Design a protein around this ligand. Structure first.
Ligand code: JB5
Ligand code: JB5
Lengths: 216, 206
């Protein structure tokens, strides 16, 4: 039984949560996901969540006042506050396993430019805070990163049921003149294991040499 | 002018991205089950050579891509076994006329689909990261967003901390250098902040 709160200025964008793995998890009552519009915690008539950065630079920074009020209401001392950001620690499969046993995740989604640093500083006096990057590409905002984190974590939650995977095949055994590798049809568990290992080796060394401790 | 076609068994998943309005991209989402052959609308089957999970059927994907792709298409297949998707990749793809993104489950699509497609068109199998998702839909979302923000009209080292009003909040002041009006010094301070944060969070970048 896990609770996930997502805070965003684009709550309708978190709707893809409702299908696939996360939707089934919610429907089965293993997790509850609640999405909050950040502007709920604004008090000016224009619902302003951002302002220009001190020191200059392009873009805007999300205001600490609004985030502070939001997180005051949503978070407790047991909360794990997740802040997706291009400047975060890497989010890995190990991170996913670690967070899969948490009672309460709060995910704060900002734009790329980011949230005033003092929000995370202030929250860390009260709760555990993790700023993480899902990758070294650039998104407009944290919302898509939130969906990725949620999907990676939820599939590891109890109750929701190295080397690259090599190629996989299914019926029919010949298709457009391309045959499935005969060893896979042979029913020889040993030779199949050997073949799959060799395929995975070739693929990892070609596509992800870093996984085996090589350059690039 | 970019066209993106996405093929998925969860078409609802992708509808929220389609809302940017400028009309410079077209993003179309297609339900893979449109191309199934049987009344049960089967999209996957047991893997040859045994093992857990299911593999998506070549006959179904073959029909879908035949209808949707042309020789000009860049066929993107998100997969944990892919080449890394990077910002360099996003820049490259941002000038393409036609991307087709084939979303499959973790276990993947029969390899003959991509192998066959690669005899007629460019195919790119890519991973958005080394965590495991159940399906490629979230990865497609990440890819679409990273690419489209580089298409004009939609509008190293880590970035260090940023600050805005008010100057003092809950007992913490904005670093005074940022208010100094010494812009060379501010740049140096930010560069040192970046160095420190990169060392701490992403030493791989050095
Ligand atoms: N909040 C954000 C904004 C953009 C991002 N781009 C890549 C990875 N994480 C991100 C988080
Ligand atoms: N098609 C898929 C399925 C799962 C994934 N997990 C991580 C990265 N890419 C993925 C693509």
């Amino acid at each position: 039984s896990m609770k996930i709160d997502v805070v965003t200025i684009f709550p309708e964008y978190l709707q893809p949560v409702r299908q696939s793995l996360p939707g089934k998890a919610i429907d089965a009552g293993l997790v509850d996901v609640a999405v909050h519009d950040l502007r709920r915690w604004t008090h000016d008539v224009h619902k302003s969540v951002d302002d220009s950065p001190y020191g200059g630079g392009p873009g805007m920074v999300m205001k600490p006042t609004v985030w502070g009020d939001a997180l005051d209401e949503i978070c407790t001392s047991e909360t794990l506050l997740v802040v997706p950001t291009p400047a975060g620690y890497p989010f890995t499969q190990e991170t996913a396993w670690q967070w899969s046993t948490e009672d309460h995740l709060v995910i704060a989604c900002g734009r790329y430019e980011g949230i005033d640093q003092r929000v995370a500083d202030d929250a860390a006096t009260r709760m555990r805070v993790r700023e993480v990057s899902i990758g070294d590409y650039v998104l407009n905002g944290g919302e898509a990163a939130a969906l990725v984190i949620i999907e990676a974590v939820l599939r590891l939650v109890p109750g929701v049921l190295s080397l690259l995977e090599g190629p996989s095949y299914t019926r029919p055994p010949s298709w457009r003149g391309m045959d499935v590798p005969p060893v896979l049809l042979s029913g020889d568990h040993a030779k199949i294991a050997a073949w799959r290992a060799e395929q995975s080796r070739q693929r990892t060394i070609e596509r992800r040499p870093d996984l085996l401790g090589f350059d690039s």
